[PDB]
Amino acid sequence: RFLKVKNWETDVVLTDTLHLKSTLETGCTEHICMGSIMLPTKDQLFPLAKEFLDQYYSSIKRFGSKAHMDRLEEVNKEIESTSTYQLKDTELIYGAKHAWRNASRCVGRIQWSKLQVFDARDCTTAHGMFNYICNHVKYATNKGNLRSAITIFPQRTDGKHDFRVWNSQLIRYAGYKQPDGSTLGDPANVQFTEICIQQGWKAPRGRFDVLPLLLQANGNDPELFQIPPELVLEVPIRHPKFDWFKDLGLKWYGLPAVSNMLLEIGGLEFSACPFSGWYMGTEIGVRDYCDNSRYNILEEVAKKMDLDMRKTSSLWKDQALVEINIAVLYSFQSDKVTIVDHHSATESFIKHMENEYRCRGGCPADWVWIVPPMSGSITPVFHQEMLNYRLTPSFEYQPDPWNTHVW
Amino acid sequence: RFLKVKNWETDVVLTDTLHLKSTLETGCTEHICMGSIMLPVRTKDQLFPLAKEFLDQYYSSIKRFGSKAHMDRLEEVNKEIESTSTYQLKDTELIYGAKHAWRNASRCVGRIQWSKLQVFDARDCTTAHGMFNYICNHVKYATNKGNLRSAITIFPQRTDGKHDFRVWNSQLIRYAGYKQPDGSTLGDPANVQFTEICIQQGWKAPRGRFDVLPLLLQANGNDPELFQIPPELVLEVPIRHPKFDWFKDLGLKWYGLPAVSNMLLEIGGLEFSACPFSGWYMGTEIGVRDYCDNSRYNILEEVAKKMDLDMRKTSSLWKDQALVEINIAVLYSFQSDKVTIVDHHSATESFIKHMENEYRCRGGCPADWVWIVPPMSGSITPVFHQEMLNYRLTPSFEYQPDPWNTHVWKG
Numbered sequence: 001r002f003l004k005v006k007n008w009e010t011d012v013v014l015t016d017t018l019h020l021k022s023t024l025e026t027g028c029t030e031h032i033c034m035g036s037i038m039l040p041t042k043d044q045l046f047p048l049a050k051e052f053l054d055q056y057y058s059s060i061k062r063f064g065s066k067a068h069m070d071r072l073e074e075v076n077k078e079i080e081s082t083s084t085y086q087l088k089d090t091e092l093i094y095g096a097k098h099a100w101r102n103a104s105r106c107v108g109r110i111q112w113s114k115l116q117v118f119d120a121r122d123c124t125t126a127h128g129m130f131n132y133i134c135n136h137v138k139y140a141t142n143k144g145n146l147r148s149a150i151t152i153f154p155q156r157t158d159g160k161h162d163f164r165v166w167n168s169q170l171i172r173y174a175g176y177k178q179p180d181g182s183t184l185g186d187p188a189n190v191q192f193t194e195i196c197i198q199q200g201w202k203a204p205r206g207r208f209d210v211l212p213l214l215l216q217a218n219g220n221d222p223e224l225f226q227i228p229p230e231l232v233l234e235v236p237i238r239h240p241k242f243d244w245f246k247d248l249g250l251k252w253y254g255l256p257a258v259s260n261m262l263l264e265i266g267g268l269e270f271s272a273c274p275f276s277g278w279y280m281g282t283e284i285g286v287r288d289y290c291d292n293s294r295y296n297i298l299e300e301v302a303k304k305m306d307l308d309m310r311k312t313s314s315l316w317k318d319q320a321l322v323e324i325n326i327a328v329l330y331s332f333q334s335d336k337v338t339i340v341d342h343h344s345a346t347e348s349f350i351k352h353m354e355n356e357y358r359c360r361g362g363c364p365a366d367w368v369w370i371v372p373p374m375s376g377s378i379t380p381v382f383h384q385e386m387l388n389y390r391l392t393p394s395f396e397y398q399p400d401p402w403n404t405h406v407w
Numbered sequence: 408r409f410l411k412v413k414n415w416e417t418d419v420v421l422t423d424t425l426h427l428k429s430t431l432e433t434g435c436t437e438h439i440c441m442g443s444i445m446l447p448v449r450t451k452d453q454l455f456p457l458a459k460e461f462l463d464q465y466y467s468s469i470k471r472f473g474s475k476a477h478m479d480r481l482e483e484v485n486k487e488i489e490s491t492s493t494y495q496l497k498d499t500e501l502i503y504g505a506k507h508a509w510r511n512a513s514r515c516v517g518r519i520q521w522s523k524l525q526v527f528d529a530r531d532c533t534t535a536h537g538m539f540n541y542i543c544n545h546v547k548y549a550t551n552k553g554n555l556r557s558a559i560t561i562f563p564q565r566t567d568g569k570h571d572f573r574v575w576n577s578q579l580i581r582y583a584g585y586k587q588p589d590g591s592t593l594g595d596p597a598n599v600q601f602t603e604i605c606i607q608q609g610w611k612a613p614r615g616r617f618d619v620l621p622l623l624l625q626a627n628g629n630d631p632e633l634f635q636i637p638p639e640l641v642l643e644v645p646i647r648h649p650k651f652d653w654f655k656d657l658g659l660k661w662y663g664l665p666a667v668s669n670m671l672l673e674i675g676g677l678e679f680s681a682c683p684f685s686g687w688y689m690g691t692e693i694g695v696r697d698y699c700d701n702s703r704y705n706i707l708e709e710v711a712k713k714m715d716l717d718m719r720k721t722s723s724l725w726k727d728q729a730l731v732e733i734n735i736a737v738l739y740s741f742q743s744d745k746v747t748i749v750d751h752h753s754a755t756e757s758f759i760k761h762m763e764n765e766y767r768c769r770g771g772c773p774a775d776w777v778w779i780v781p782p783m784s785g786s787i788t789p790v791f792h793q794e795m796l797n798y799r800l801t802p803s804f805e806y807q808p809d810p811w812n813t814h815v816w817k818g
């Protein structure tokens with residue numbers, strides 16, 4: 001019932017008690033581990049509300065105070081009457097900070113308490129959503145000095161009046177299938193791109209076309225908007241050694257901003273809650289550029305380096321991978337756009353885990369996600385046992401809107 | 408019940424039914440995943456079911472389930488257990504069992520090879536000198552002058568747990584490590600405590616960076632005894648780089664034969680506590696972990712110095728650069744000396760083909776993603792993108808406590 005994790009490189013052992021406050025299910029059983037699977041009423045709501053307010057009031061050192069007992073009654077009264085309830089600004093901010101704190105797949109959580117929360121619960125239309133988002137984008141970008149932020153749209157009511165951002169991230173590139181058989185731009189977004197087109201978008205059909213926002217307010221049909229080009233900070237990619245690298249025509253955007261997840265706080269569900277931090281270099285250079293089903297540039301890079309691509313055992317893919325990732329980091333750093341390398345980010349996460357264990361009794365972490373997609377064992381997280389479990393407030397995946405939406 | 412796994416790069420979806428035959432526990436629950444934790448005498452009562460389940464599996468594999476030989480064999484094992492408290496495997500069952508423990512090993516990327524395993528039956532062994540001889544023959548057979556052949560050698564099974572056969576070494580061939588008074592380590596830091604044991608038992612340590620350790624062998628629960636593997640049987644590869652001529656002057660070498668000697672083989676409820684097995688290396692095992700782990704040889708800095716990489720900031724990726732060059736070197740060296748090795752692209756690609764065929768023909772393939780994905784360049788190998796299901800099938804290989812912690816010293 002009380003659990004130990006060991007770091008096999010430093011011998012530091014930590015004791016986890018926080019998991020006993022775990023709530024949702026993992027997908028694993030005593031018979032089978034699903035650790036590597038990507039996704040394994042009025043009566044329902046009040047326990048969820050109480051559990052949250054209890055942790056909130058405990059966190060400001062006022063557990064069991066009149067103010068605590070008063071709030072619980074007020075929410076109880078509101079749920080019995082209205083069938084839902086409203087969070088105080090203080091609770092909303094705490095809730096959002098803790099959903100990030102509890103994100104077991106996130107390596108950057110040392111930052112969790114520095115989150116700017118934009119309360120957009122007063123929003124009513126897609127134009128309003130567009131405004132809130134441009135404002136979030138400009139605030140977070142901060143001319144390259146990135147600041148973590150979330151913007152929180154109104155909560156689910158009856159589930160037929162959902163606010164949704166249809167985009168998977170606020171800033172992404174279009175993907176197009178061509179007569180060729182090959183894919184131009186990002187193959188991850190082919191389907192979303194087509195949805196844009198079929199909703200009215202004027203696609204320039206290039207390699208790096210910033211997608212428009214498809215924004216759904218109050219369960220209404222989603223509407224298109226172009227983000228002002230001037231708010232999208234992009235970085236041309238060059239290499240500090242290879243003068244040919246720039247002519248691959250590679251660029252990426254400065255702002256990673258997840259926009260398709262669901263924030264659960266105290267039983268309430270926020271289906272539009274785009275949030276953003278800054279990039280770890282491997283996300284672009286390893287995954288975005290080198291995944292076979294993404295930009296898949298390894299072949300083209302290895303050729304310009306004139307490596308022996310004859311046998312996999314020359315490690316040409318691995319050589320090219322490192323150079324691409326050097327170029328990503330160098331480019332962001334030369335243009336003064338915040339970025340972190342996987343060495344620095346994973347070392348910070350170890351420090352963060354030690355703080356969480358000492359201060360809070362644990363830190364849920366999903367090793368499969370935390371260990372970077374290159375050079376795994378040379379980062380400390382590789383040697384770090386982790387325990388994965390679900391705490392709330394949380395961010396959750398949710399069905400893509402187009403499969404759900406009644407037109 | 409069916410479970411599906413998807414490969415997110417290819418969209419190939421596979422269906423697992425084999426997990427229904429899983430017995431032992433994972434360590435996980437509905438509330439906690441322990442997927443990244445390294446480690447999360449029997450009675451007649453529990454033994455006959457374990458025997459029955461195994462013999463049912465054996466007899467199914469040979470298409471003789473429910474046959475007269477099948478039924479007679481169950482009755483013969485039943486009686487043997489009721490009379491003696493244990494039972495003996497037929498040679499055919501031992502071979503089947505050992506191959507299946509490997510087939511079932513969810514942390515092994517090399518399992519495409521599982522049906523090609525040379526099983527050496529050492530159950531007639533009685534003494535440490537006997538074990539030594541068996542182990543030399545395994546090494547010489549598996550080494551095959553560099554054309555490596557997989558093999559296992561199986562010493563007598565556990566009886567009352569007071570007469571165990573144990574190989575005290577964690578692998579048959581490993582380099583010594585010596586903690587210096589100044590706190591630095593000479594040789595391999597992983598093997599310090601074991602080296603200390605060997606010296607206490609009387610080993611004369613040459614005290615270099617790559618001293619092959621002696622075998623420390625325990626027969627029949629007796630105190631273990633030391634033996635030196637004949638050096639002519641220990642194939643070694645000096646490590647050099649195809650472009651960098653200073654690489655040789657680092658004085659690196661490694662041995663060709665990876666041979667695990669501290670695991671326990673369970674077959675039909677019987678426990679073989681001494682069962683050294685060997686295959687051949689995937690390059691990253693040496694190049695990434697043995698050479699570049701912080702708690703191991705730790706050569707990243709020295710290599711990076713010699714490459715004249717920018718070392719003042721981690722974001723130059725100097726470690727990542729040096730890591731790739733070292734791994735190029737290991738693969739080049741082995742290939743040049745005609746010693747079997749596999750690179751991590753070839754090995755993971757082969758594993759995915761193995762895994763798909765297993766799903767098709769067997770109904771599943773338990774796999775532990777944490778261990779299967781290579782410790783460098785993870786996502787440019789196809790296994791990173793493959794969902795996997797981890798569960799425990801028997802026959803199996805299992806960890807066991809280090810024998811110095813449990814052994815009752817006779818003197």
Ligand code: HEM
Binds near residue numbers: 100115
């Ligand atoms: C400040 C810098 C941040 C860094 C360096 C960072 C790092 C990362 C990385 C590398 C991943 C894996 C992404 C992937 O592989 O696709 C991730 C996942 C995640 N992060 Fe962060 N993060 C940051 C900020 C944030 C913020 C501000 C939030 C929420 C407020 C957040 C919530 C999450 C969530 C929910 C996931 C998992 C997403 C999923 O399962 O698809 N992160 N983090």
Ligand code: HEM
Binds near residue numbers: 514516524749804
């Ligand atoms: C044919 C060549 C083989 C290759 C390339 C190979 C590859 C590997 C690698 C890379 C690992 C992880 C090792 C580590 O990180 O320490 C491993 C684990 C393992 N393999 Fe293999 N393997 C091979 C043959 C075998 C054989 C012959 C057996 C037994 C008959 C075996 C059984 C196991 C077991 C039980 C593990 C888990 C070890 C542990 O948890 O410490 N493998 N394999």
Ligand SMILES: Cc1cc(N)nc(COc2cncc(CNCCc3cccc(F)c3)c2)c1
Binds near residue numbers: 276278397
């Ligand atoms: C906020 C933030 C900061 C930072 N440095 N990086 C990020 C990266 O976020 C993402 C990037 N790319 C994709 C996603 C969404 N991932 C969903 C994975 C998935 C795919 C398919 C099925 C499934 F169940 C789960 C998030 C986010």
Ligand SMILES: Cc1cc(N)nc(COc2cncc(CNCCc3cccc(F)c3)c2)c1
Binds near residue numbers: 445446665692806
């Ligand atoms: C047969 C074979 C072939 C091949 N290519 N590679 C191997 C590698 O096998 C090992 C190498 N080094 C160490 C081990 C033993 N693993 C121990 C893992 C461990 C460490 C500490 C605690 C724990 F619970 C578990 C196996 C084995």
Ligand SMILES: C[C@H](O)[C@H](O)[C@H]1CNc2nc(N)[nH]c(=O)c2N1
Binds near residue numbers: 035036037792794795
């Ligand atoms: C199948 C497997 O779970 C999948 O490829 C995971 C592995 N680890 C990951 N880790 C991160 N950070 N991001 C990912 O998208 C994935 N993908």
Ligand SMILES: C[C@H](O)[C@H](O)[C@H]1CNc2nc(N)[nH]c(=O)c2N1
Binds near residue numbers: 443777
């Ligand atoms: C804590 C963590 O599980 C541990 O470092 C694991 C990670 N994956 C591994 N994978 C392999 N093949 N071998 C290892 O020793 C490890 N170590």
Ligand SMILES: [Zn+2]
Binds near residue numbers: 035435441
């Ligand atoms: Zn699990």
